[PDB]
Design a protein around this ligand. Structure first.
Ligand code: HEM
Ligand code: HEM
Ligand code: XVO
Ligand code: XVO
Ligand code: H4B
Ligand code: H4B
Ligand code: CL
Ligand code: CL
Ligand code: GD
Ligand code: GD
Ligand code: ZN
Lengths: 401, 402
């Protein structure tokens, strides 16, 4: 049972929950790989038994009446057909648990308040699109954002797979150039290639909302233009730096992740887009400033008249703070839910305390919980964390092509 | 077989083949990563020594030669006769450099080959120990033009207690527990402060009182030694454009000299081997001055800057901290005292990483320690995956002598 210390306060806890870890991670006694982004059939019954036992424990109803019964149906469902269907409530409780189990999510204090849309009866790219569009419009909610996940049909053998070919529902275009460099978002350069490939007309913009590429089983993808009124965007302005607006920067309101495999009770949902709301540093620091993303940092420094000639002026840090100020100021003026890294990390500590008494600990990935600016000014920095894999879970999956 | 490591900034990919020769085991398992935790007989002595001698003879391009085999047998014979062996001087210099080179939490290792090794293995008493330390401080400080130095005191050996420096660093500020539970000075140094007083140090009552040294010779109690004032180069903190900042009375010292770690070379253990380099500005400005459990000056600075400290979304904390780091860099450069900012340091560590991949097929690095505590993703190390493992020779933590 790992001893885990908070260095700001001196407190000690033990992660007893870690002993239940499922799909082992990438680290061995001889070398730690925690910093790596992507870690280097009849036993479906084991993962179904486990999840069902989880479900009935969470309603103070283990070993009573319906618990026994539900074990036999999945036994019979898999005995007969090889796979099984989740009761609607189980799908809800498992979608919530997988968010609860996400070691890299700093937003998990909200895990109990998640809206699960059941799309298990979906059948093709036009049906998906309307599900995706209901999610987007529900989640966006005129800027009063609400956590949502739409669960598309589970995978079963011998037939294809529902997939969203975009990493998120809202992505900006990346346009390669006559000289390799990129106008727009370089993280998306490739899905821009596929959208252009399958018929989309490339704009000329740094911020062109990409179309969607939705794929029904066995059929090739099909482009879907997103309703421009459904794609809520925030222009970025700064409260005191009047020229910031003139940089023509924008970001979207809705972080909706559409490429992760949701895995509940041994079942695989390669299409289950989830969404919450942004922490400002995701936008201001990673998306706008990462050297391989919009990479705007030096442009804002010039505008601030900072000495970019020596790094000891800390011009990078100064411009990065003002970018984050602009992001928070703009989303607030636009009345769009956003949370700064201090409020977010403080609520994560509160979540750690809740999880400690509730489940005996909490899988947390220190490198992803600690914000990408001002790390040690937030409490999570001083909190030792234990990383491990519990089920239900969100897992990465290979790109469909 | 070998970990594939990606740099996300450039897209680059390497394989850390060096990780496969990891001489000891870390705290992680396939169940669970513990990489964020701060504190994770003749046969094995023989095989560690044999491995180190092989390393040493590789570096001087004498692998498998006559000199090499003679030294193995010499060591095996001395381990059989005495239960221990003695390093030649050149092996010691190589072993201290390697230990620095192998330290995964150290972002300053581009410099590892330029290390000044003082051989104090003939030290006899605490008084001689103090003189060796004063000359280390004098040489490393070098009037503000800092040089990397390690002074190696006699190895652990059977029959004798250890040389130990009780202080975690050669220069530390006292932490005076006051009666509220509040601390005047550095709260990290409350324990060593009480020990110094208990050993007869007359306390001051400032916030930057330099602590005396508690020096332990084999099988003796610790002995108190006052550092001569003109040997502890200090830097008053001022800000280039916030002039009220100098009225905070803040200071820090020039020399970061870690004195409580164990240097291990070929199975031999040196519990006393203080090493020193020069500061990276975020250690002082962010960690030592802004940590809530250290000097915790963040709020007072933000208030003086007239930031709105009632809401977090004004980012007053980030704004105050940036300016504290500016003050640190300005103050040291004004005082002509070596200092590196987290941008210059992380960039040189990237060059270290590339040098080490070519030299050894990888480099042990502890990402959470290499990434600076502010502005993390603005530095290049953030976007570099890293492999953490224990190579030997090594610096290791050890329990406090008390
Ligand atoms: C509601 C407020 C939320 C906040 C503030 C938030 C914030 C974050 C942040 C900053 C990360 C770091 C990962 C990255 O940026 O690459 C993350 C990871 C993650 N979050 Fe959340 N999130 C929220 C909601 C949700 C919801 C509703 C779900 C799913 C139901 C979710 C699932 C995940 C997963 C699976 C990851 C890890 C994926 C990865 O590392 O790429 N989050 N979250
Ligand atoms: C000369 C410039 C140097 C710089 C800029 C530098 C920088 C750093 C920094 C920022 C850390 C993390 C400190 C912390 O917050 O815990 C560190 C750790 C460390 N350094 Fe270096 N260092 C330098 C020289 C040296 C030398 C000369 C040695 C030994 C010969 C050394 C050995 C270590 C070790 C063993 C650690 C790990 C201890 C720990 O992480 O608690 N460093 N270094
Ligand atoms: C470098 N970084 C920009 C990578 C972007 C990225 C890639 C992923 F796969 C991923 F799951 C997330 C999660 C972001 C997220 C999800 C839900 C709410 C929220 N507020 N945020 C973010
Ligand atoms: C409080 N927290 C910052 C940790 C303090 C701490 C504890 C250690 F054991 C340790 F080796 C170092 C390294 C500090 C250092 C050494 C050499 C040069 C440099 N520039 N810095 C720092
Ligand atoms: C608990 C957490 O891992 C701990 O505070 C670590 C994080 N990274 C660090 N990095 C450095 N350079 N120094 C530190 O003391 C720490 N502390
Ligand atoms: C190498 C390092 O692990 C990698 O850059 C990680 C660190 N933390 C991150 N944190 C977030 N939110 N997103 C990322 O892409 C990363 N990348
Ligand atoms: Cl994002
Ligand atoms: Cl320090
Ligand atoms: Gd101007
Ligand atoms: Gd001024
Ligand atoms: Zn690990």
């Amino acid at each position: 049972f790992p001893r885990v210390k908070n260095w700001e306060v001196g407190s000690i806890t033990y992660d007893t929950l870690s002993a239940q870890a499922q799909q082992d991670g990438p680290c061995t006694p001889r070398r730690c790989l925690g910093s790596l982004v992507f870690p280097r059939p009849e036993q479906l019954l084991s993962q179904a038994r486990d999840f069902i036992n989880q479900y009935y424990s969470s309603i103070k109803r283990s070993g009573s009446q319906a618990h026994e019964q539900r074990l036999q149906e999945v036994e019979a469902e898999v005995a007969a057909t090889g796979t099984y269907q989740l009761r609607e409530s189980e799908l809800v409780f498992g979608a919530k648990q997988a968010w609860r189990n996400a070691p890299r999510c700093v937003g998990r204090i909200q895990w109990g308040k998640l809206q699960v849309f059941d799309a298990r009866d979906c059948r093709s790219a036009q049906e998906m699109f309307t599900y995706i569009c209901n999610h987007i419009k529900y989640a966006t909610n005129r800027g009063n954002l609400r956590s949502a996940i739409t669960v598309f049909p589970q995978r079963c053998p011998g037939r294809g797979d529902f997939r969203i070919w975009n990493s998120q529902l809202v992505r900006y275009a990346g346009y390669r150039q006559q000289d390799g460099s990129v106008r727009g978002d370089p993280a998306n350069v490739e899905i821009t290639e596929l959208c252009i490939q399958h018929g989309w007309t490339p704009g000329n913009g740094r911020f062109d909302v990409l179309p969607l590429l939705l794929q029904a089983p066995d059929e090739p993808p099909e482009l879907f233009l997103l309703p421009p009124e459904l794609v809520l965007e925030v222009p970025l302005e700064h409260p005191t730096l009047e020229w910031f607006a003139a940089l023509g920067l924008r970001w979207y309101a809705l972080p909706a992740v559409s490429n992760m495999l949701l895995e509940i009770g041994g079942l695989e949902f390669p299409a289950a887009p989830f969404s919450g709301w942004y922490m400002s540093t995701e936008i201001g620091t990673r998306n706008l400033c990462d050297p391989h993303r919009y990479n705007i940092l030096e442009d804002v420094a010039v505008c601030m008249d900072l000495d970019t000639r020596t790094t000891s002026s800390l011009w990078k840090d100064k411009a990065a703070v003002e970018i984050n100020v602009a992001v928070l100021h703009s989303y607030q003026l636009a009345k769009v839910t956003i949370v700064d890294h201090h409020a977010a990390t403080a609520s994560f500590m509160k979540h750690l305390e809740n999880e400690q008494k509730a489940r005996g600990g909490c899988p947390a990935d220190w490198a992803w919980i600690v914000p990408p600016i001002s790390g040690s000014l937030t409490p999570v920095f001083h909190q030792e964390m234990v990383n491990y894999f519990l089920s239900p879970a969100f897992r990465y999956q290979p790109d469909p092509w």
